[PDB]
Amino acid sequence: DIVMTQSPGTLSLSPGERATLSCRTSQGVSSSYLAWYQQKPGQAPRLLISGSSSRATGIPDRFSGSGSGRDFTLTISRLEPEDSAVYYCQQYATSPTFGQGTRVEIKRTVAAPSVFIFPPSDEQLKSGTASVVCLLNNFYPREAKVQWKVDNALQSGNSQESVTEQDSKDSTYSLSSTLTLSKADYEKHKVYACEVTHQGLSSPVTKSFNRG
Amino acid sequence: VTMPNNDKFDKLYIWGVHHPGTDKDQTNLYVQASGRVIVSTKRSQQTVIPNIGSR
Amino acid sequence: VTMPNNDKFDKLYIWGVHHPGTDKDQTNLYVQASGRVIVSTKRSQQTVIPNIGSRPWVRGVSSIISIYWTIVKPGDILLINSTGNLIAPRGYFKIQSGKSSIMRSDAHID
Amino acid sequence: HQILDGKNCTLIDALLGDPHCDDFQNKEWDLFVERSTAYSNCYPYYVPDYATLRS
Ligand SMILES: *[C@@H]1O[C@H](CO)[C@@H](O[C@@H]2O[C@H](CO)[C@@H](O[C@H]3O[C@H](CO[C@H]4O[C@H](CO)[C@@H](O)[C@H](O)[C@@H]4O)[C@@H](O)[C@H](O[C@H]4O[C@H](CO)[C@@H](O)[C@H](O)[C@@H]4O[C@H]4O[C@H](CO)[C@@H](O)[C@H](O)[C@@H]4O)[C@@H]3O)[C@H](O)[C@H]2NC(C)=O)[C@H](O)[C@H]1NC(C)=O
Ligand SMILES: *[C@@H]1O[C@H](CO)[C@@H](O[C@@H]2O[C@H](CO)[C@@H](O[C@@H]3O[C@H](CO[C@H]4O[C@H](CO)[C@@H](O)[C@H](O)[C@@H]4O)[C@@H](O)[C@H](O[C@H]4O[C@H](CO)[C@@H](O)[C@H](O)[C@@H]4O)[C@@H]3O)[C@H](O)[C@H]2NC(C)=O)[C@H](O)[C@H]1NC(C)=O
Ligand SMILES: *[C@@H]1O[C@H](CO)[C@@H](O[C@@H]2O[C@H](CO)[C@@H](O[C@@H]3O[C@H](CO)[C@@H](O)[C@H](O[C@H]4O[C@H](CO)[C@@H](O)[C@H](O)[C@@H]4O)[C@@H]3O)[C@H](O)[C@H]2NC(C)=O)[C@H](O)[C@H]1NC(C)=O
């Protein structure tokens, strides 16, 4: 069973730079039976390389393939914001096996989050639930802190969140935080705030609404 | 042609030799007349002479 | 030549190949120079190349015959392609298996 | 123990790559089971040392 080990786990480089990805195999694999794939969040894998160095139809020449035996390489000569994806190696000398993947991040000039806050709708509140939303929009890096305050009191154990993957055109991230209270608990309080800490902020940002 | 074993395990190579029914069949598939197959290693030696004849 | 086995039992064909002492002996007995003997079935394959050369003198002869055997199953067919040097089979032995053996002894049977 | 039903293939047909044995490519077994119903459907071949190879 040929094991494919990729290096590094995560790679972060700015546009114009060269990316080097490595693949290590448990068996000597002939270089005429090895492929490389690109997978952008939610898409199907795109064949980049086949036969270790043969470029697939519709692939840019900045994508270069190399290697032999157990040591294989993918080189991306000139990074674009569009190259933010996971890369995979595959051997096809025996029944096809693939690597664990390499996540390539494109660097961007530090961007502060455009922060928004949304109250629960009357329609929702009629169900017995009061969910409160906070949006951090178009920022870089992905690291960001979100704190929920109810009458200026830090909540915890109720706040779920998720983040979109790096934008393939502008390389930014966005974050959705959801404070889920009950209607009854929502109605015990009146001040709802979302505090955001981030690299592009010289000081923390707070957005809020009142009522009730 | 050689094929070197640089792995940590033994390789098993399965191969064969074709013996034509006629001499015409020989030269059509392999220009050259009945010749030899020699498969050698540092431990083994395997020579096969093709024998043409109706099967 | 073929010889098809259409009986209910296995046939045993005993045959051989003659290897001459000289090249003159080859061409006198078989015009053609050293050629091949191919005895094939649907299970077996037996190719023999005659090798001409001086052998040990046995009763007038400095040559020798190699003996080979073949079993042909029911539905199988004995097929002999030979370009010469064939010591042909005249037929077959009916071959089975059972309370049958062989022993070496000089004991008097009584 | 992991059983592999040979079905209409023999172990050697599965090895060599007889077209109706493509399902056996790269398979494993603790016990390979040969059926009497098995057949071959490819070029005529002879494996001298058949029994050794199968084993
Ligand atoms: C390759 O190398 C080997 C070894 O060197 C060689 O082999 C030799 O081959 C020759 C011929 O093929 C053979 O010659 C004689 O064979 C008979 C045996 O001679 C032995 O006699 C004793 C046994 O009785 C034994 O102890 C001895 O040690 C001796 O070896 C011998 O009888 C023959 O003689 C008869 O035949 C010739 C014709 O071939 C006649 O010319 C003779 O007169 C004689 O005929 C008479 O008697 C017969 C009845 O016996 C009768 O019918 C006839 O009418 C007449 O009255 C051979 O002279 C050698 O024995 C043999 N040597 C060995 C060691 O095997 C090969 O020949 C070499 N190859 C080549 C191409 O050179
Ligand atoms: C291992 O090997 C065995 C033996 O070779 C295979 O068993 C046969 O498989 C074939 C192919 O699937 C079967 O063919 C089908 O036969 C049906 C009956 O027709 C004859 O069947 C037998 C065998 O010839 C005769 O004895 C009998 O008298 C009939 O005259 C047909 O109804 C089938 O027609 C249609 O079948 C399907 C659609 O349903 C499609 O393939 C076609 O559209 C086709 O027109 C077909 O002809 C055959 O019947 C099998 N034998 C028996 C005895 O049933 C195994 O398939 C093979 N593989 C395993 C076991 O995995
Ligand atoms: C296996 O069995 C088959 C059964 O038919 C047998 O096929 C025969 O093969 C011989 C040899 O090739 C054929 O004979 C040839 O036919 C013509 C004229 O007879 C010629 O092409 C050949 O003559 C050659 O002889 C010269 C002297 O050296 C050569 O220098 C020159 O190249 C000539 O071409 C030869 O005689 C024969 O026709 C077929 N039979 C049939 C029915 O087709 C085959 O030989 C067997 N295998 C063996 C014996 O190994």
Short mmCIF file of all heavy atoms in Angstrom, two decimals, chain A residues 176-210:
data_model
loop_
_atom_site.label_atom_id
_atom_site.label_comp_id
_atom_site.label_asym_id
_atom_site.label_seq_id
_atom_site.Cartn_x
_atom_site.Cartn_y
_atom_site.Cartn_z
N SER A 176 -18.26 34.68 10.61
CA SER A 176 -19.63 34.74 11.12
C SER A 176 -19.74 34.21 12.52
O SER A 176 -19.54 33.01 12.75
CB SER A 176 -20.57 33.94 10.23
OG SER A 176 -21.84 33.80 10.82
N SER A 177 -20.06 35.08 13.48
CA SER A 177 -20.23 34.66 14.85
C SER A 177 -21.67 34.73 15.28
O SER A 177 -22.36 35.72 15.04
CB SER A 177 -19.39 35.49 15.78
OG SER A 177 -19.59 35.08 17.10
N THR A 178 -22.16 33.67 15.91
CA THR A 178 -23.55 33.60 16.30
C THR A 178 -23.76 33.34 17.79
O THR A 178 -23.52 32.24 18.29
CB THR A 178 -24.29 32.52 15.50
OG1 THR A 178 -24.18 32.79 14.09
CG2 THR A 178 -25.77 32.50 15.90
N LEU A 179 -24.25 34.36 18.47
CA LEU A 179 -24.61 34.28 19.87
C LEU A 179 -26.03 33.78 19.98
O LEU A 179 -26.97 34.49 19.63
CB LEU A 179 -24.49 35.66 20.51
CG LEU A 179 -24.93 35.78 21.96
CD1 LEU A 179 -23.98 34.99 22.83
CD2 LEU A 179 -24.97 37.24 22.36
N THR A 180 -26.22 32.56 20.44
CA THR A 180 -27.57 32.05 20.49
C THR A 180 -28.09 32.06 21.91
O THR A 180 -27.59 31.34 22.78
CB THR A 180 -27.69 30.63 19.91
OG1 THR A 180 -27.27 30.63 18.54
CG2 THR A 180 -29.14 30.17 19.99
N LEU A 181 -29.10 32.88 22.13
CA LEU A 181 -29.76 32.98 23.42
C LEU A 181 -31.18 32.50 23.24
O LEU A 181 -31.61 32.24 22.11
CB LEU A 181 -29.77 34.44 23.90
CG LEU A 181 -28.42 35.16 23.84
CD1 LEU A 181 -28.62 36.61 24.23
CD2 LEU A 181 -27.43 34.47 24.76
N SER A 182 -31.93 32.39 24.33
CA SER A 182 -33.35 32.14 24.16
C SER A 182 -34.02 33.49 24.11
O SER A 182 -33.44 34.48 24.56
CB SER A 182 -33.93 31.31 25.30
OG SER A 182 -33.97 32.03 26.50
N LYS A 183 -35.25 33.54 23.59
CA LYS A 183 -36.06 34.75 23.58
C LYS A 183 -36.16 35.33 24.98
O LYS A 183 -35.96 36.53 25.19
CB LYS A 183 -37.46 34.46 23.04
CG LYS A 183 -38.42 35.65 22.93
CD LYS A 183 -39.82 35.15 22.58
CE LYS A 183 -40.75 36.24 22.05
NZ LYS A 183 -41.31 37.10 23.13
N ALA A 184 -36.50 34.45 25.93
CA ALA A 184 -36.65 34.80 27.33
C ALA A 184 -35.38 35.43 27.89
O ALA A 184 -35.46 36.43 28.60
CB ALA A 184 -37.00 33.56 28.13
N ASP A 185 -34.22 34.87 27.56
CA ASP A 185 -32.98 35.42 28.07
C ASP A 185 -32.62 36.71 27.36
O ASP A 185 -32.15 37.66 27.99
CB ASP A 185 -31.84 34.42 27.92
CG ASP A 185 -31.99 33.24 28.87
OD1 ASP A 185 -32.04 33.45 30.06
OD2 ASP A 185 -32.08 32.13 28.39
N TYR A 186 -32.88 36.77 26.06
CA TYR A 186 -32.68 37.98 25.27
C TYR A 186 -33.43 39.15 25.90
O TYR A 186 -32.87 40.25 26.03
CB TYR A 186 -33.13 37.72 23.83
CG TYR A 186 -32.97 38.87 22.85
CD1 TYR A 186 -31.73 39.18 22.31
CD2 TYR A 186 -34.09 39.60 22.46
CE1 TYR A 186 -31.60 40.22 21.40
CE2 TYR A 186 -33.96 40.64 21.54
CZ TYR A 186 -32.72 40.95 21.02
OH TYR A 186 -32.60 41.97 20.12
N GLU A 187 -34.68 38.90 26.31
CA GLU A 187 -35.55 39.90 26.92
C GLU A 187 -35.23 40.29 28.37
O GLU A 187 -35.90 41.14 28.95
CB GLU A 187 -36.98 39.41 26.85
CG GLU A 187 -37.51 39.35 25.43
CD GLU A 187 -38.86 38.70 25.33
OE1 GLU A 187 -39.37 38.25 26.32
OE2 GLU A 187 -39.37 38.65 24.23
N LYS A 188 -34.19 39.69 28.96
CA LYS A 188 -33.73 40.09 30.28
C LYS A 188 -32.72 41.22 30.15
O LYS A 188 -32.32 41.82 31.15
CB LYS A 188 -33.08 38.91 31.00
CG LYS A 188 -34.02 37.78 31.36
CD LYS A 188 -33.24 36.58 31.89
CE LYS A 188 -34.15 35.40 32.18
NZ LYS A 188 -33.38 34.17 32.52
N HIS A 189 -32.25 41.46 28.93
CA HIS A 189 -31.16 42.38 28.70
C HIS A 189 -31.49 43.36 27.60
O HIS A 189 -32.52 43.23 26.93
CB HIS A 189 -29.93 41.57 28.34
CG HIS A 189 -29.59 40.58 29.40
ND1 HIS A 189 -29.05 40.95 30.62
CD2 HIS A 189 -29.71 39.23 29.44
CE1 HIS A 189 -28.85 39.88 31.35
NE2 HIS A 189 -29.24 38.82 30.67
N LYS A 190 -30.64 44.36 27.41
CA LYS A 190 -30.91 45.32 26.35
C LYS A 190 -29.68 45.77 25.58
O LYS A 190 -29.82 46.38 24.52
CB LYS A 190 -31.61 46.56 26.91
CG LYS A 190 -33.03 46.32 27.40
CD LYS A 190 -33.66 47.61 27.89
CE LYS A 190 -35.06 47.37 28.44
NZ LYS A 190 -35.65 48.61 29.00
N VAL A 191 -28.48 45.48 26.05
CA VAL A 191 -27.32 45.92 25.28
C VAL A 191 -26.54 44.74 24.71
O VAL A 191 -26.05 43.89 25.44
CB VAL A 191 -26.41 46.79 26.14
CG1 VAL A 191 -25.23 47.27 25.31
CG2 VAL A 191 -27.22 47.94 26.71
N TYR A 192 -26.42 44.69 23.38
CA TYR A 192 -25.71 43.58 22.74
C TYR A 192 -24.53 44.06 21.92
O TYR A 192 -24.68 44.84 20.99
CB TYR A 192 -26.68 42.79 21.89
CG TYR A 192 -27.75 42.15 22.74
CD1 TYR A 192 -28.93 42.82 23.04
CD2 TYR A 192 -27.53 40.89 23.24
CE1 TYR A 192 -29.88 42.23 23.84
CE2 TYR A 192 -28.48 40.30 24.04
CZ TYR A 192 -29.65 40.95 24.34
OH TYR A 192 -30.57 40.34 25.15
N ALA A 193 -23.32 43.61 22.28
CA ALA A 193 -22.13 44.08 21.59
C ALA A 193 -21.20 42.96 21.12
O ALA A 193 -21.10 41.89 21.72
CB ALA A 193 -21.35 45.02 22.50
N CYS A 194 -20.49 43.25 20.03
CA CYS A 194 -19.50 42.36 19.43
C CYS A 194 -18.13 43.04 19.39
O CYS A 194 -17.94 44.04 18.68
CB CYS A 194 -19.94 41.98 18.00
SG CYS A 194 -18.77 40.92 17.12
N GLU A 195 -17.17 42.52 20.14
CA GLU A 195 -15.84 43.10 20.16
C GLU A 195 -14.87 42.31 19.30
O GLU A 195 -14.75 41.09 19.44
CB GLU A 195 -15.27 43.19 21.57
CG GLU A 195 -13.86 43.76 21.60
CD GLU A 195 -13.29 43.89 22.99
OE1 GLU A 195 -14.05 44.07 23.92
OE2 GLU A 195 -12.09 43.79 23.13
N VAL A 196 -14.17 43.02 18.42
CA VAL A 196 -13.23 42.43 17.49
C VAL A 196 -11.79 42.89 17.71
O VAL A 196 -11.50 44.09 17.69
CB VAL A 196 -13.66 42.74 16.05
CG1 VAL A 196 -12.64 42.19 15.07
CG2 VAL A 196 -15.04 42.12 15.80
N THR A 197 -10.88 41.93 17.89
CA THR A 197 -9.46 42.25 17.99
C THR A 197 -8.75 41.68 16.77
O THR A 197 -9.00 40.54 16.36
CB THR A 197 -8.80 41.70 19.28
OG1 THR A 197 -9.46 42.24 20.44
CG2 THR A 197 -7.33 42.09 19.34
N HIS A 198 -7.89 42.48 16.15
CA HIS A 198 -7.25 42.06 14.92
C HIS A 198 -5.96 42.83 14.63
O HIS A 198 -5.76 43.94 15.11
CB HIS A 198 -8.23 42.22 13.74
CG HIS A 198 -7.74 41.62 12.46
ND1 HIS A 198 -6.98 42.32 11.54
CD2 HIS A 198 -7.88 40.37 11.95
CE1 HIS A 198 -6.68 41.54 10.53
NE2 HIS A 198 -7.20 40.34 10.75
N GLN A 199 -5.08 42.20 13.85
CA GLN A 199 -3.77 42.74 13.46
C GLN A 199 -3.83 44.10 12.77
O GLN A 199 -2.94 44.92 12.92
CB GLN A 199 -3.07 41.74 12.54
CG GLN A 199 -1.66 42.15 12.17
CD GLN A 199 -0.76 42.19 13.38
OE1 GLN A 199 -0.59 41.19 14.07
NE2 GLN A 199 -0.20 43.36 13.65
N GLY A 200 -4.90 44.33 11.99
CA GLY A 200 -5.07 45.59 11.27
C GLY A 200 -5.74 46.66 12.14
O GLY A 200 -6.04 47.75 11.64
N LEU A 201 -5.96 46.36 13.41
CA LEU A 201 -6.56 47.30 14.34
C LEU A 201 -5.56 47.76 15.38
O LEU A 201 -5.06 46.96 16.18
CB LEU A 201 -7.75 46.63 15.04
CG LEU A 201 -8.86 46.12 14.13
CD1 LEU A 201 -9.90 45.40 14.97
CD2 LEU A 201 -9.47 47.29 13.39
N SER A 202 -5.29 49.06 15.41
CA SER A 202 -4.41 49.64 16.42
C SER A 202 -5.03 49.52 17.82
O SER A 202 -4.32 49.47 18.83
CB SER A 202 -4.11 51.08 16.07
OG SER A 202 -5.28 51.86 16.12
N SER A 203 -6.36 49.44 17.86
CA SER A 203 -7.09 49.15 19.08
C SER A 203 -8.35 48.37 18.71
O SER A 203 -8.83 48.49 17.58
CB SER A 203 -7.45 50.44 19.81
OG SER A 203 -8.38 51.18 19.08
N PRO A 204 -8.92 47.59 19.65
CA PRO A 204 -10.11 46.76 19.48
C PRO A 204 -11.35 47.56 19.09
O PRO A 204 -11.51 48.71 19.49
CB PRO A 204 -10.24 46.08 20.84
CG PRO A 204 -8.83 45.91 21.30
CD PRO A 204 -8.07 47.08 20.74
N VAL A 205 -12.20 46.93 18.29
CA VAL A 205 -13.41 47.54 17.75
C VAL A 205 -14.68 46.93 18.33
O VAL A 205 -14.82 45.72 18.41
CB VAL A 205 -13.44 47.39 16.21
CG1 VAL A 205 -14.78 47.82 15.65
CG2 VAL A 205 -12.32 48.24 15.62
N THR A 206 -15.62 47.78 18.74
CA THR A 206 -16.87 47.26 19.29
C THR A 206 -18.08 47.76 18.52
O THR A 206 -18.26 48.97 18.35
CB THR A 206 -17.04 47.64 20.77
OG1 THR A 206 -15.94 47.13 21.53
CG2 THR A 206 -18.33 47.05 21.32
N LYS A 207 -18.93 46.83 18.07
CA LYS A 207 -20.19 47.19 17.43
C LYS A 207 -21.32 46.75 18.32
O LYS A 207 -21.18 45.77 19.05
CB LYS A 207 -20.32 46.59 16.03
CG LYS A 207 -19.21 47.04 15.10
CD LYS A 207 -19.24 48.55 14.95
CE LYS A 207 -18.15 49.04 14.00
NZ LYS A 207 -18.03 50.52 14.01
N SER A 208 -22.44 47.46 18.28
CA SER A 208 -23.53 47.09 19.17
C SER A 208 -24.88 47.60 18.74
O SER A 208 -24.99 48.48 17.89
CB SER A 208 -23.27 47.63 20.56
OG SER A 208 -23.41 49.03 20.56
N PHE A 209 -25.90 47.06 19.39
CA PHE A 209 -27.27 47.53 19.24
C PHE A 209 -27.97 47.43 20.58
O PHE A 209 -27.53 46.71 21.47
CB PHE A 209 -28.06 46.72 18.19
CG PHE A 209 -28.34 45.28 18.55
CD1 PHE A 209 -29.42 44.93 19.35
CD2 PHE A 209 -27.54 44.28 18.05
CE1 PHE A 209 -29.68 43.60 19.65
CE2 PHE A 209 -27.80 42.97 18.34
CZ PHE A 209 -28.87 42.62 19.15
N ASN A 210 -29.05 48.18 20.71
CA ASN A 210 -29.79 48.18 21.95
C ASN A 210 -31.19 47.68 21.70
O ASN A 210 -31.70 47.84 20.59
CB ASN A 210 -29.79 49.57 22.56
CG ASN A 210 -28.39 50.07 22.84
OD1 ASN A 210 -27.57 49.37 23.44
ND2 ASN A 210 -28.10 51.27 22.41
#
